[PDB]
Short mmCIF file of C-alpha atoms and ligand atoms in Angstrom, two decimals:
data_model
loop_
_atom_site.label_atom_id
_atom_site.label_comp_id
_atom_site.label_asym_id
_atom_site.label_seq_id
_atom_site.Cartn_x
_atom_site.Cartn_y
_atom_site.Cartn_z
CA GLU H 68 171.41 28.47 154.56
CA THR H 69 170.11 27.16 151.19
CA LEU H 70 172.29 25.49 148.45
CA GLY H 71 171.79 28.52 146.12
CA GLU H 72 172.66 30.82 149.05
CA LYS H 73 175.93 28.88 149.40
CA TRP H 74 176.54 29.02 145.77
CA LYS H 75 176.01 32.68 145.98
CA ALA H 76 178.40 33.11 148.62
CA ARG H 77 181.07 30.85 146.82
CA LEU H 78 180.63 32.83 143.74
CA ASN H 79 181.60 36.22 145.31
CA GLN H 80 184.51 34.72 146.83
CA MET H 81 186.06 33.76 143.52
CA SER H 82 188.96 35.61 141.92
CA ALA H 83 188.57 36.98 138.45
CA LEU H 84 190.47 34.19 136.91
CA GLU H 85 188.45 31.62 138.85
CA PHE H 86 185.17 33.39 138.00
CA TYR H 87 185.72 33.73 134.35
CA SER H 88 186.82 30.08 134.11
CA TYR H 89 183.67 28.98 136.05
CA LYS H 90 181.28 31.31 134.26
CA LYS H 91 180.83 29.32 130.98
CA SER H 92 182.14 25.83 132.13
CA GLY H 93 179.88 23.18 130.79
CA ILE H 94 177.12 25.56 129.55
CA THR H 95 175.31 25.71 126.13
CA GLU H 96 176.05 28.86 124.07
CA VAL H 97 174.95 29.79 120.60
CA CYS H 98 177.62 30.99 118.16
CA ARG H 99 176.83 34.89 117.45
CA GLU H 100 179.92 35.79 115.60
CA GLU H 101 178.16 35.65 112.43
CA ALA H 102 175.15 37.46 113.73
CA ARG H 103 177.35 40.30 115.33
CA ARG H 104 178.98 41.20 112.12
CA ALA H 105 175.57 41.26 110.07
CA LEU H 106 173.90 43.37 112.57
CA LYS H 107 176.74 45.90 112.79
CA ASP H 108 176.76 46.14 109.02
CA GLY H 109 172.80 47.03 109.44
CA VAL H 110 171.64 43.75 107.65
CA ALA H 111 168.07 43.14 108.73
CA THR H 112 166.95 40.40 106.03
CA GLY H 113 169.60 37.81 107.10
CA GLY H 114 167.37 36.12 109.78
CA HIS H 115 169.87 36.81 112.48
CA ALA H 116 168.57 37.22 116.10
CA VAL H 117 169.25 40.57 117.57
CA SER H 118 170.51 38.96 120.91
CA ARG H 119 171.02 35.40 122.48
CA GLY H 120 167.63 35.81 124.03
CA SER H 121 165.83 34.18 120.94
CA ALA H 122 167.77 31.02 121.57
CA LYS H 123 166.97 31.18 125.32
CA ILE H 124 163.28 31.45 124.66
CA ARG H 125 163.26 28.91 121.74
CA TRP H 126 164.87 26.52 124.17
CA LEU H 127 161.85 26.60 126.30
CA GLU H 128 159.06 26.65 123.60
CA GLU H 129 160.70 23.79 121.70
CA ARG H 130 160.36 21.52 124.61
CA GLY H 131 156.62 22.63 125.38
CA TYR H 132 157.29 24.77 128.33
CA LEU H 133 154.96 27.46 126.67
CA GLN H 134 153.18 28.01 123.30
CA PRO H 135 152.94 31.66 122.52
CA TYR H 136 149.81 32.77 120.94
CA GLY H 137 147.49 35.64 120.46
CA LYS H 138 148.63 38.99 121.69
CA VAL H 139 152.05 38.73 123.16
CA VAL H 140 153.42 41.21 125.65
CA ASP H 141 157.28 41.28 126.08
CA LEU H 142 158.24 43.19 129.22
CA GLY H 143 161.76 44.32 129.30
CA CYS H 144 162.26 43.33 125.75
CA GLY H 145 165.70 45.06 125.38
CA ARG H 146 166.94 44.59 121.79
CA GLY H 147 163.77 42.43 121.26
CA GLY H 148 165.13 38.79 120.92
CA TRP H 149 162.08 37.24 122.66
CA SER H 150 159.69 39.70 120.52
CA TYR H 151 161.30 38.60 117.20
CA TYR H 152 161.17 34.87 118.09
CA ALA H 153 157.59 35.13 119.30
CA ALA H 154 156.67 36.75 116.02
CA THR H 155 157.53 33.51 113.97
CA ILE H 156 154.90 31.28 115.91
CA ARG H 157 151.78 30.06 114.33
CA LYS H 158 149.01 31.55 116.45
CA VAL H 159 150.63 34.70 117.46
CA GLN H 160 148.55 37.79 116.26
CA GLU H 161 150.97 40.72 117.54
CA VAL H 162 153.80 41.33 119.91
CA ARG H 163 153.77 44.28 122.07
CA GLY H 164 157.46 45.12 123.51
CA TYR H 165 158.46 47.58 126.26
CA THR H 166 161.97 48.35 127.81
CA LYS H 167 163.43 50.88 130.07
CA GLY H 168 166.44 51.53 127.93
CA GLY H 169 168.63 53.45 130.25
CA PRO H 170 172.35 54.19 130.51
CA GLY H 171 173.50 50.43 130.93
CA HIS H 172 170.33 48.91 129.50
CA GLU H 173 169.52 48.10 125.84
CA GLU H 174 167.57 49.82 123.13
CA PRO H 175 165.21 48.00 120.76
CA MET H 176 166.93 46.99 117.40
CA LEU H 177 164.91 47.09 114.26
CA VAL H 178 165.54 43.96 112.02
CA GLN H 179 163.13 42.19 109.44
CA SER H 180 163.04 38.63 110.66
CA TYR H 181 159.80 36.66 109.73
CA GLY H 182 156.78 38.30 111.46
CA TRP H 183 158.58 41.60 111.87
CA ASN H 184 155.66 43.74 110.80
CA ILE H 185 153.39 42.46 113.53
CA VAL H 186 155.95 43.69 116.32
CA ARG H 187 155.92 46.98 118.14
CA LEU H 188 159.02 47.71 120.19
CA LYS H 189 158.76 50.75 122.62
CA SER H 190 161.77 52.16 124.41
CA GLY H 191 161.93 54.60 127.45
CA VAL H 192 159.04 52.49 129.18
CA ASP H 193 159.44 51.53 132.78
CA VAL H 194 157.05 48.50 133.39
CA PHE H 195 156.71 49.21 137.02
CA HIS H 196 154.89 52.35 136.04
CA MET H 197 152.45 51.26 133.25
CA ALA H 198 149.11 49.79 134.00
CA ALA H 199 148.56 45.95 133.63
CA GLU H 200 146.81 44.93 130.42
CA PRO H 201 144.95 41.73 129.31
CA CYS H 202 146.93 39.71 127.05
CA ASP H 203 147.23 35.99 125.64
CA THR H 204 151.01 35.49 126.42
CA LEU H 205 152.93 37.26 129.18
CA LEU H 206 156.57 37.67 128.69
CA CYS H 207 158.84 39.18 131.24
CA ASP H 208 162.86 38.91 131.23
CA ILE H 209 163.59 41.45 133.89
CA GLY H 210 166.19 41.04 136.65
CA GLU H 211 169.80 42.30 136.94
CA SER H 212 172.60 40.34 138.57
CA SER H 213 174.16 41.73 141.66
CA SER H 214 177.07 40.56 143.98
CA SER H 215 174.71 40.57 146.89
CA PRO H 216 171.91 38.07 147.25
CA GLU H 217 169.78 40.80 148.93
CA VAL H 218 169.66 43.05 145.94
CA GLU H 219 168.97 39.97 143.53
CA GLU H 220 166.14 38.91 145.96
CA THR H 221 164.69 42.41 146.22
CA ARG H 222 165.00 42.90 142.39
CA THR H 223 163.15 39.49 141.71
CA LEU H 224 160.34 40.19 144.27
CA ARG H 225 159.58 43.57 142.62
CA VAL H 226 159.27 41.94 139.15
CA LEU H 227 157.04 39.38 140.56
CA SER H 228 154.70 41.92 142.19
CA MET H 229 154.46 43.72 139.01
CA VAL H 230 153.94 40.56 137.06
CA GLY H 231 151.15 39.40 139.53
CA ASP H 232 149.00 42.36 138.22
CA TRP H 233 149.34 41.05 134.63
CA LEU H 234 148.75 37.39 135.71
CA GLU H 235 145.38 38.45 137.42
CA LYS H 236 144.27 39.09 133.90
CA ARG H 237 144.96 35.30 133.46
CA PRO H 238 146.96 35.02 130.25
CA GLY H 239 146.92 31.64 128.56
CA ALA H 240 150.70 31.47 128.54
CA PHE H 241 153.61 33.00 130.34
CA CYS H 242 157.37 33.02 130.78
CA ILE H 243 158.75 34.99 133.77
CA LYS H 244 162.48 35.33 134.58
CA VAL H 245 163.08 34.64 138.09
CA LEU H 246 166.60 36.09 138.64
CA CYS H 247 166.83 34.87 142.53
CA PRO H 248 164.79 31.76 143.19
CA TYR H 249 167.32 30.30 145.95
CA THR H 250 166.28 32.10 149.06
CA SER H 251 163.67 30.50 151.24
CA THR H 252 161.47 33.57 151.08
CA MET H 253 161.57 33.21 147.17
CA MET H 254 160.91 29.69 147.35
CA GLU H 255 157.95 30.37 149.59
CA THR H 256 156.59 33.05 147.09
CA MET H 257 156.91 30.99 144.10
CA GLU H 258 154.92 28.26 145.87
CA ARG H 259 152.08 30.59 146.39
CA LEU H 260 152.28 31.98 142.91
CA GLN H 261 152.36 28.45 141.44
CA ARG H 262 149.30 27.36 143.64
CA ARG H 263 147.58 30.54 142.01
CA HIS H 264 148.67 30.59 138.49
CA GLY H 265 150.27 27.25 137.72
CA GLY H 266 153.33 26.59 135.80
CA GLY H 267 156.83 25.87 137.33
CA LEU H 268 160.38 26.86 137.27
CA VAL H 269 162.95 25.74 134.50
CA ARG H 270 166.62 26.07 134.24
CA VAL H 271 167.82 26.86 130.72
CA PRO H 272 171.15 25.37 130.03
CA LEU H 273 172.25 28.39 127.76
CA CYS H 274 172.25 30.27 131.11
CA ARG H 275 175.69 31.10 132.43
CA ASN H 276 176.93 29.56 135.71
CA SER H 277 177.35 32.94 137.21
CA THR H 278 173.65 33.38 137.50
CA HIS H 279 170.88 31.24 139.31
CA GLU H 280 168.36 32.49 136.98
CA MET H 281 165.30 30.25 136.36
CA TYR H 282 162.12 30.88 134.21
CA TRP H 283 158.61 30.46 135.35
CA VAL H 284 156.84 28.88 132.55
CA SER H 285 153.18 28.17 132.25
CA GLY H 286 153.85 24.74 130.73
CA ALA H 287 156.01 23.40 133.48
CA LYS H 288 154.52 21.33 136.50
CA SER H 289 157.55 20.39 138.60
CA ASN H 290 157.98 21.19 142.38
CA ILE H 291 159.61 24.51 143.06
CA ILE H 292 161.89 23.37 145.88
CA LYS H 293 163.11 20.43 143.92
CA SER H 294 163.59 22.50 140.69
CA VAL H 295 165.60 25.23 142.70
CA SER H 296 167.53 22.75 144.71
CA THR H 297 168.41 20.70 141.57
CA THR H 298 169.76 23.74 139.78
CA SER H 299 171.56 24.80 142.90
CA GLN H 300 173.29 21.49 143.05
CA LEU H 301 174.35 21.75 139.30
CA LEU H 302 176.02 25.12 139.75
CA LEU H 303 177.76 24.05 142.96
CA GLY H 304 179.04 20.93 141.31
CA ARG H 305 180.56 22.79 138.34
CA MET H 306 182.54 24.87 140.94
CA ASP H 307 184.45 21.87 142.33
CA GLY H 308 185.06 20.11 138.95
CA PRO H 309 187.71 20.93 136.34
CA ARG H 310 186.84 23.32 133.72
CA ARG H 311 184.50 21.76 131.18
CA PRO H 312 184.28 23.06 127.55
CA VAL H 313 181.46 25.25 126.34
CA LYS H 314 178.84 23.30 124.36
CA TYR H 315 178.48 25.59 121.28
CA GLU H 316 175.45 25.35 119.03
CA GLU H 317 174.18 27.00 115.83
CA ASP H 318 172.34 30.09 116.77
CA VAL H 319 168.72 30.47 115.82
CA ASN H 320 167.73 31.92 112.27
CA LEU H 321 164.30 33.49 112.11
CA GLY H 322 164.05 34.03 108.33
CA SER H 323 162.74 37.05 106.71
CA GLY H 324 159.36 38.51 105.35
CA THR H 325 155.87 39.68 106.55
CA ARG H 326 153.14 37.78 108.02
C1 AT9 O 210 179.15 40.60 140.75
C2 AT9 O 210 178.45 39.14 140.27
F1 AT9 O 210 177.80 38.70 141.31
C3 AT9 O 210 177.45 39.49 139.14
O1 AT9 O 210 176.14 40.11 139.49
C4 AT9 O 210 177.30 38.00 138.53
C5 AT9 O 210 176.83 37.97 137.13
O2 AT9 O 210 177.73 38.56 136.30
P1 AT9 O 210 177.73 38.24 134.79
O3 AT9 O 210 179.09 38.06 134.27
O4 AT9 O 210 176.78 37.05 134.60
O5 AT9 O 210 176.84 39.34 134.07
P2 AT9 O 210 175.70 39.70 133.08
O6 AT9 O 210 174.80 40.58 133.72
O7 AT9 O 210 176.35 40.27 131.82
O8 AT9 O 210 175.17 38.33 132.75
O9 AT9 O 210 178.54 37.54 138.72
C6 AT9 O 210 179.27 38.16 139.79
N1 AT9 O 210 180.50 38.54 139.19
C7 AT9 O 210 180.92 39.50 138.14
N2 AT9 O 210 182.18 39.41 137.94
C8 AT9 O 210 182.74 38.94 138.99
C9 AT9 O 210 184.18 38.64 139.33
O10 AT9 O 210 185.18 39.30 138.70
N3 AT9 O 210 184.37 38.03 140.58
C10 AT9 O 210 183.46 37.47 141.18
N4 AT9 O 210 183.62 36.82 142.38
N5 AT9 O 210 181.99 37.49 140.96
C11 AT9 O 210 182.06 38.29 139.81
N1 SAH O 211 161.81 48.42 135.16
C1 SAH O 211 161.90 48.05 133.87
N2 SAH O 211 161.02 48.29 132.90
C2 SAH O 211 161.48 47.95 131.72
N3 SAH O 211 162.41 47.22 131.16
C3 SAH O 211 163.22 46.94 132.20
C4 SAH O 211 163.21 47.31 133.36
N4 SAH O 211 164.32 46.97 134.19
C5 SAH O 211 165.02 46.31 133.26
N5 SAH O 211 164.57 46.38 132.03
C6 SAH O 211 165.01 45.90 130.71
O1 SAH O 211 164.81 44.44 130.66
C7 SAH O 211 165.88 43.74 129.78
C8 SAH O 211 166.09 42.44 130.32
S1 SAH O 211 167.40 41.72 129.09
C9 SAH O 211 166.18 40.66 128.01
C10 SAH O 211 166.42 40.79 126.55
C11 SAH O 211 165.42 40.19 125.83
N6 SAH O 211 164.75 38.97 126.55
C12 SAH O 211 166.04 39.63 124.55
O2 SAH O 211 165.68 38.45 124.01
O3 SAH O 211 167.00 40.19 123.92
C13 SAH O 211 167.29 44.82 130.01
O4 SAH O 211 167.52 45.18 128.53
C14 SAH O 211 166.57 46.01 130.74
O5 SAH O 211 166.84 47.36 130.27
MG1 MG O 212 174.22 37.91 134.99
#
């Protein structure tokens, strides 16, 4: 039994009050109250991010874990937070977004932050059925939390199998969400993937404590077992400590205008 699997077992045993207290304890979060009201009014020129994903992907890029450029493919774009942030980067030529958009899923949102005119967001697209294309930056944020590790592991592996066909085209940069990296099989799978495509797993502090999600980014180089184990220790430690306040930060503002 791994530490992450122990974390998942402990998480499922929490009561509602225990879980919600632990979910945001000590995590970093961007303030989106201003963004929510502006978006609901239909404001598209205020620079607001359509979701908290823009801050997530910026945290990785600002620290040099990937440098988006060329043609960017955003698989599972949802509202489009990754695509809108990717559209503001120097060497990005265009951003192609795809998302399933089902009953519980998200539909693309149309805003006019900087570089909006080089973005195409398409809804109703299941990426498991579309053919892999060559690209320069491969983005994927797919994987849905579940109570059982078996479902999370299965969902993660299906994503990685689909992503492997895109990575065979060898994009220069990638950022792939790994919902469940904490099983021995998943650690083994990532090791083979890292040997073949490089990169490494990174834990973003904006992530909630209720998910073990890590991001496979081309710029990272750390060991996979150490990366997952260190993250599992952090999540386990926050369980047995008193509730720590949320570290709030200003949300990302992406400006306005065409490129
Ligand atoms: C069922 C889950 F495993 C979810 O799969 C995971 C992420 O749930 P989440 O809040 O991060 O959701 P999201 O997808 O929006 O991000 O936490 C667990 N979980 C959710 N509610 C509760 C609860 O009451 N009690 C306990 N013990 N576990 C809970
Ligand atoms: N098979 C699939 N094909 C395409 N999109 C999928 C998918 N399974 C899940 N998704 C979508 O992937 C999205 C992951 S949420 C990520 C949102 C985005 N990173 C942002 O910054 O806003 C969800 O909205 C979900 O609808
Ligand atoms: Mg979750």
